[PDB]
């Protein structure tokens, strides 16, 4: 039943007595459900250390991973160029999933096309699919460049991208001069960040490999910035703002901030902003190139050093005080522009906030996961605040990255109880936070279920989740935030301290039981 004045959605409509009676009759009559005592016993068993030992012996089963496949990162890299269409050679379900997944994260339109390869292509290949798809996309959506990635289908059948695009050009399906970069992005190697790296390296090679004869290093007095796989608009904004305040000429390659933040003003803009083809063609004339996320831009680094002859600096991510300072000093050294007083004042203000919130942040224990560069930068910042990272997880990390993170942890006394895990999924993390309970989690939306499990064990065992990373599906407009530089450090510090204070208020709200510490002033 529904009251017209106060209509209830599924929650709490299905908490009515008639619905509960229905569900009870259904379960008792036809579900053959296990008894509640057995279920409770099994859950309690899965919260134990023996279950953790069984869980960490897994070799073939992956449960709740924290990574995606390469063509997603390839599409996101492709979206960062001016009037450019992402074209994924293979099956259409992959493109449907990519579009829906980015739509749920960014809450914005995402444009991507497929050539819709079917069982026929499994034995003949996708030459005709490539030709017709290129012609149709160019005729219909009028893009200036088509950046082509692959699904695991075409990767397994061994489709030759270069030959396909060449044969499409020579037979008149697309103009010969028309820019069609390509990159092999197989889903069973690496992850989405690897796909971003492959797509960017392919585009750079397409635009600069055959025109290096007249290129002079440093002749345009700019610094190339390669952001990598980045799902925060505020990071692009803050990098541009920080470079502009220094008066530093720069070129941001693969800049998607405009196309993912178009205004709602009565028209639909499929394309907006992005790196121009002229910028990519003129990139080898820059003084140097800075990779914001080096640990998944290795192929890009190799091509940049081998071909453009740029001495790429060994910089970490500009997350947190020390590494932001190092990034700024490296930029000042390369460009010759002194660090302005506004940046000094911003750094001092961040230090002031650190001094203000240090008492509440000291000694807090965090589990945390994400992409390698973001994880290591966040761990560095947590050590800078005096916090203790306990469980550090990176499903797509490698052994060299783990060694670097271990070296970072050894440099601080607050990393004595930290352990770095690579190749582990969120079920491993659930076991870890059951057996060695931290104060908070830091990760994407998938962690919410873990929190639920903790609350099922008890309120005193619940580990709250802090949504920092990708993807975030259950909150609105968090993709507008910033994690890089002093501004990003300020935002993350505010989020951490306020989460701690909110948890303290929740724990201390009980009348005449715990409300003695429910202080007005914190």
């Amino acid at each position: 039943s529904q009251q017209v004045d106060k209509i209830k959605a599924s929650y709490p409509l299905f908490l009515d007595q008639d619905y509960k009676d229905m569900l009870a009759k259904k379960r008792d009559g036809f579900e053959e459900k296990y008894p509640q005592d057995k279920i409770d016993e099994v859950f309690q068993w899965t919260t134990t250390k023996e279950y953790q030992e069984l869980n960490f012996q897994r070799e073939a089963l992956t449960v709740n991973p924290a990574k995606a496949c390469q063509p997603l990162g390839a599409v996101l890299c492709a979206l960062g160029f001016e009037k450019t269409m992402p074209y994924v050679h293979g099956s259409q379900g992959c493109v449907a999933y990519f579009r829906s997944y980015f739509n749920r994260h960014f809450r914005e339109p995402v444009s991507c096309v497929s050539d819709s390869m079917t069982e026929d292509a499994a034995v003949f290949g996708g030459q005709q699919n490539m030709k017709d798809g290129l012609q149709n996309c160019k005729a219909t959506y009028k893009p200036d460049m088509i950046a082509v990635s692959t699904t695991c289908m075409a990767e397994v059948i061994g489709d030759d991208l270069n030959a396909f695009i060449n044969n499409s050009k020579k037979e008149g399906f697309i103009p010969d001069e028309f820019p069609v970069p390509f990159a092999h992005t197989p889903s069973f190697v690496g992850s989405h960040v690897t796909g971003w790296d492959n797509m960017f390296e392919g585009i750079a090679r397409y635009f600069t490999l055959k025109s290096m004869d007249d290129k002079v290093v440093g002749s345009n007095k700019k610094i190339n910035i390669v952001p990598g796989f980045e799902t925060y608009l505020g990071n692009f904004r803050v990098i541009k703002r920080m470079l502009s305040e220094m008066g530093v000429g720069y070129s941001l390659l693969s800049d998607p901030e405009e196309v993912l933040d178009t205004p709602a003003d009565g028209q639909f803009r499929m394309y907006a902003g992005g790196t121009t083809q002229e910028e990519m063609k003129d990139a080898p004339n820059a003084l140097n190139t800075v990779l914001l996320q080096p640990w998944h831009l290795e192929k890009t680094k190799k091509f940049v050093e081998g071909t453009w002859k740029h001495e790429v600096p060994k910089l970490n991510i500009p997350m947190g005080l020390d590494w932001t300072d190092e990034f700024l000093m490296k930029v000042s050294e390369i460009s010759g522009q002194p660090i302005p007083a506004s940046l000094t004042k911003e750094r001092g203000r961040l230090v002031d906030m650190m001094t203000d919130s240090h008492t509440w942040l000291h000694g807090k224990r965090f589990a945390l996961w994400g992409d390698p560069d973001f994880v290591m930068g966040l761990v560095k910042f947590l050590l800078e605040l005096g916090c203790e990272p306990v469980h550090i997880l990176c499903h797509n990390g490698n052994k060299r990255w783990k060694k670097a993170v271990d070296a970072i942890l050894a440099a601080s006394p607050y990393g004595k109880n930290a352990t770095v895990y690579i190749g582990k999924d969120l079920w491993h993390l659930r076991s870890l936070v059951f057996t060695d309970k931290p104060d908070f989690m830091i990760g994407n939306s998938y962690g919410k279920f873990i929190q639920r499990d903790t609350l099922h064990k008890g309120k005193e065992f619940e580990v709250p989740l802090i949504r920092i990373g990708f993807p975030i599906f259950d909150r609105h407009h968090l993709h507008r935030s910033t994690t890089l530089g002093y501004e990003g450090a300020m935002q993350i510090l505010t989020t951490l301290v306020n989460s701690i204070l909110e948890r303290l208020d929740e724990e201390t709200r009980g009348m005449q039981a715990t409300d003695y510490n429910h202080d007005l002033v914190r």
């Binding site: 229905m22 579900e31 073939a60 050539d115 390869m117 219909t140 397994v156 709602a264 003003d265």
Partner: protein, 477 residues
């Protein structure tokens, strides 16, 4: 009513395409005539999508794992292949269930094999067997395992049927291999077909020799309802208020025991024809179970469906049906009286795949709303045969529409509201047009039944009459 103008718009929109794409797409666009009964003479469907025109369709893996097999709560479903698939399909569809997730319930989790280069090169049968052993060790309370194949499984020479047989015999467990490779078929519909084939081949006949379940003349099974936002529950209570006993529901909040007990029911109430007609016809052929379609969107279709279903039974069930209708009449009458004046005369364009586009029109008409254009991502000619009599004269019909085509149609026709998937939501919000996402129902609901009609009307009113839609033009421009 302006049939020639709709035909003209179709031609102007088709002008952009190359010759082959234009000739293909011309057959998927039509102007509805209510008098025409055979849709094949006007519209073509269930064909491959044109390359590079940004279609909305999914794959067979989405149709099998994400639609049919996923809602089964007490079984564990393994995404066999690389990691992307189950990750993008994890908890994206609001198929609701009751259970302790991680202990006896596993819908919202992502079990995957996560192939690397070596699994692609040397195969993954041994890895699948090791994964099955690990699943048995870490998840003892599961009641079955499904193996949903992805594209490399079909492409490389994996044989998961023999591994499933051997492991099931070894472990006394039901292990169901599903060859739902994404490159098979043209859309999610063949995924539905493959999933139903797997259901009949490996699950449906377990209790054929078992006769320990007490049956009553009032046994039905709900087929094709996936409990989106609780939809199935909102239907089930009505069937239990009419005096019927719902043994099973496929497959939202469904259990494998319900599937095994389904052949014991007296009637199969099929909600989604397109995804479950295959198993419905198989049960009619093998067990003699009659099956009928019903509609629980809006009070009118709900009342008609209840009366027909009761007509399939004796007089006591009919009397209980009349009691239920009389009980729920004032509530939906109040809903109508409150919301119809604020939605009367509004025009809606709906794009959805398979069953929803002609199956929710009655609820809009109950609110005094007119559907002027309706489209299907992956339906067949029989769905359009039902749709043409469901829709009105000179309305737009369109199969596997492209983004460009749909945007041009919306610009010309100018509807007050569009119902479609999220891939269109933000495009049409930036166009200044209210949008309601039918597949997740904008994370609201349920909309089935009398209790769902109130939520449906409230949501349509709150989005259509939103004050934000009057503010997209800056006062200085």
């Amino acid at each position: 009513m302006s049939r020639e103008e709709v035909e003209s718009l179709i031609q102007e929109v088709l002008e952009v395409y190359p010759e082959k794409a234009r000739k293909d797409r011309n057959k998927h666009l039509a102007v509805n005539d209510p008098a025409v009964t055979q849709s094949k003479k006007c519209i073509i469907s269930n064909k491959k999508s044109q390359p590079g025109l940004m279609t909305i369709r999914g794959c067979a893996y989405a149709g099998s794992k994400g639609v049919v097999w996923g809602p089964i709560k007490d079984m564990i479903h393994i995404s066999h292949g690389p990691v992307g698939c189950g990750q993008y399909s994890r908890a994206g569809r609001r198929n609701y269930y009751i259970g302790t997730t991680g202990v006896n319930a596993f819908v919202t989790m992502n079990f995957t094999s996560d192939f690397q280069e070596k699994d692609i090169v040397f195969g993954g049968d041994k890895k699948l067997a090791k994964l099955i052993d690990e699943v048995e060790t870490l998840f003892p309370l599961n009641k079955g395992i499904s193996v949903q194949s992805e594209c490399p499984i079909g492409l490389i020479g994996d044989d998961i049927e023999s591994v499933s047989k051997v492991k099931g015999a070894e472990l006394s467990k039901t292990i169901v291999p599903v060859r739902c490779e994404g490159f098979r078929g043209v859309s999610q519909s063949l995924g539905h077909h493959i999933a139903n084939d797997a259901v009949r081949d490996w699950v449906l006949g377990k209790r054929d020799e078992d006769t320990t379940f007490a049956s009553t003349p009032y046994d039905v099974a709900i087929i094709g309802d996936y409990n989106i936002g609780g939809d199935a529950w909102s239907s089930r209570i009505l069937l239990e208020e009419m005096g019927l006993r719902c043994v099973a529901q496929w497959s939202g909040d469904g259990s494998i025991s319900e599937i095994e007990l389904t052949p014991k029911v007296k009637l199969n109430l099929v909600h989604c024809y397109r995804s479950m007609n295959y198993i419905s016809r198989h049960m009619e052929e093998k067990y003699g179970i009659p099956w009928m379609e019903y509609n629980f969107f809006g009070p009118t279709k709900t009342i008609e469906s209840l009366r027909a279903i009761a007509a399939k039974f004796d007089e006591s069930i009919q009397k209980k049906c009349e009691e239920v209708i009389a009980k729920y009449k004032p509530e939906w009458e109040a809903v109508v009286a409150k919301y119809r004046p604020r939605l009367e005369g509004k025009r809606v364009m709906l794009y959805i795949g398979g069953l929803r586009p002609r199956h929710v029109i009655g609820a809009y008409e109950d609110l005094g709303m007119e559907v002027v254009g309706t489209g299907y991502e992956f339906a067949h000619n029989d769905d359009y045969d039902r749709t043409m009599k469901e829709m009105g004269d000179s309305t737009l019909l369109y199969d596997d529409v492209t983004g460009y085509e749909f945007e041009e149609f919306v610009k010309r026709i100018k509807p007050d509201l569009i119902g479609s998937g999220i891939k269109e939501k933000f495009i049409f919000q930036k166009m200044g047009i209210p949008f309601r996402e039918m597949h997740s129902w904008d994370y609201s609901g349920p909309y089935h039944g009398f209790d769902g009609f109130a939520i449906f009307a409230r949501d349509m009113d709150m989005t259509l009459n939103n004050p934000c839609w009057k503010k997209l033009q800056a006062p200085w421009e």
